[PDB]
Symmetry: C4
Subunit: 209 residues, 4 copies
């Protein structure tokens, strides 16, 4: 019993996993090259199953070693799903290259120390969706009639507005043609770009605290 617990939390075992991680990453970085998957595709498709096989064992062990304690450690928890994904018979399997974040304790803090920023802002983030929701409704029934590729859908109003938010081709690509049919659209968007922009500065400042 306790004999197994010593194998898991050993430096050897953990270090061994991280080696396979770095390796299986390189394996997926050659599954891209058509030339490679031609000559060595057979070599790889099995080699991957070996890895996800070993990772199945470890995650099973990690469960028996931790029992109910396991499904409260996110990194440990997260690792579980990412293999289940890898189990299901194709692109989302590459998420298992995130365990290199989990398996390395130097990263876990960085992720957490940056997710620690998320809560002090959800009061702001939640506001935006409401702000976006009303506007996406306005546009889709304002400009949605003549510019449907941009505003034909409520959701389509989202993508264009978040783009205009990012300031990519907001003027030449969206606002200028809009102003050829609705010449006052410069009253809709110029403030919206200000309103949304004002948020970002005060956030950055609020976080430097």
């Amino acid at each position: 019993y306790l004999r197994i617990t010593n194998i898991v939390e050993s430096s050897f075992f953990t270090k061994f996993i991280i080696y396979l991680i770095v390796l299986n990453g390189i394996t997926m970085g050659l599954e891209t090259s058509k030339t490679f998957m031609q000559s060595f595709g057979v070599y790889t498709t099995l080699f991957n199953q070996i890895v996800i096989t070993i990772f199945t064992i470890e995650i099973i062990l990690r469960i028996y070693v931790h029992r109910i304690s396991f499904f409260k450690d996110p990194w440990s928890l997260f690792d579980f799903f990412v293999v289940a994904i890898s189990l299901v018979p194709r692109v989302l399997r590459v998420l298992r290259l995130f365990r290199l974040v989990t398996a390395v304790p130097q990263m876990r803090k960085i992720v957490s120390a940056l997710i620690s920023v998320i809560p002090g802002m959800l009061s702001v983030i939640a506001l935006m969706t409401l702000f976006f929701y009303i506007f996406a409704i306005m546009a889709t029934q304002l400009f949605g009639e003549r510019f449907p590729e941009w505003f034909g859908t409520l959701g389509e109003s989202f993508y264009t507005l978040f783009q205009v938010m990012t300031l990519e081709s907001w003027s030449m690509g969206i606002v200028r043609p809009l102003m050829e049919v609705y010449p006052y659209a410069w009253v809709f968007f110029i403030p919206f770009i200000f309103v949304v922009t004002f948020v970002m500065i005060n956030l950055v400042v609020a976080i430097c605290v």
Copy 2:
């Protein structure tokens, strides 16, 4: 009188306000989809009048409870106007009725703080912003009598001189979209525009720092 005053400042009423918001939001969030408004549009268009009816009441009561204190409290004040817009049957207002889904910010005491904590920046910046508009005004005049003769779509009007210059501020398509064609007729437009990008940029950065300190 005071009997209603207990209903008004009840948590139910406070909680209730936030409820109707969410429904009319979702209801207006289906007033967008053409598909929905076919079978249930009339049922919906009336539901808004139902909504816009009830919303008349709250602001009526809340005023008598607050009297002159009401028309000095911003959050409550705002609440009123959004109904008058919603009250008017120039369709635009029928579209502008959708602002009534903004009141969910007012009723939530967690939100007002969020809003308030950001407006405190304007006074430490109103000294700057007013400078910016003046800066634009002097410059917007320069272009309109410089490039306005051959580029009327971009600089033909002062208002168009504004829009084009305010765009270059954002750096969106400023070079290939604006300055490069300018340099085909007036090869020095980079003397107008390259510095203008500096000052305008330094202001906004120096503004952020002024906010970073406070």
Copy 3:
């Protein structure tokens, strides 16, 4: 001397100058509309001439009242030159609109704002000079690398400058410049991608240096 000295330093006079500024400002904002200058050009073309006369007088008084003390006050200095520009009887005809900046000078609330931001400039001259050489070294490389086939972008050292600043600003840097370049010189992702890195990394750290 002392007889005039009471007119100069009055609050009234200060208030009076700012009136013509705001007046000449809004007045200068309609000299753009072609329609007006036909029906009202004489009213306007002269009103400018009226003002620039008065400001010539004031600047004469302000000089004699302060004498050598005048030519050490920045705000005072600028105001003078902007009238000299305005004095010359077609580029300058546009540069006359700079006289709408004196509203910054006459208002003591502005002078602080401008200066307190020019007060940041010295703490950055150590940084800025590095970039120019960095910019200068690179413009030489491109102009003799890609300048042969891309003359609109890199035919001249100065043209390499404009492209680099433009690339530095991130406007159409990739699709407009780097992508077509990589169709003839497939390694242009080695020239510019670092230039985007170094230049960008500086600006963040600079704001931080000021923050």
Copy 4:
């Protein structure tokens, strides 16, 4: 020991800066084709003198400094930029890097460099995350959109450039993401979150930089 006194003189320190600015300015006309027509031969020789003379300073300082020399970064760097210049057209272009040595002689710049380079270590925990994050994502696209959009995502390396471009937000939507949505209408599930994480990272870098120095 006779030469050693010349090197660390204030004259000599200043003296290097003379040839830099001159060779810098001289290369600013080796660039202009117009000048190099009438003065090219006049120009081509001045460089060889400099690239010869510039060898000496780094030669002397080494015997003066010995093993102390190859532990001072600025001292180290100075050599390679000359060694590059020595090898007899990319190299002929890379010779112009020799105008960087002006950084060595001037102590006012190094402080900015050092005081800024200092904020690069406390973040490598973040940057390496980004490279991995890009790596996972660059793989996803390249086998997602690589089939129909190869100039943008046909190769992992091409996914890099396209993703690093979208990071800067240059023509990411109209130029890259919007056409993607005509065949794969779900590319906004790949790209919209990717836009969030990468952006949030850059902010957090700032926070780390705000605090550090």
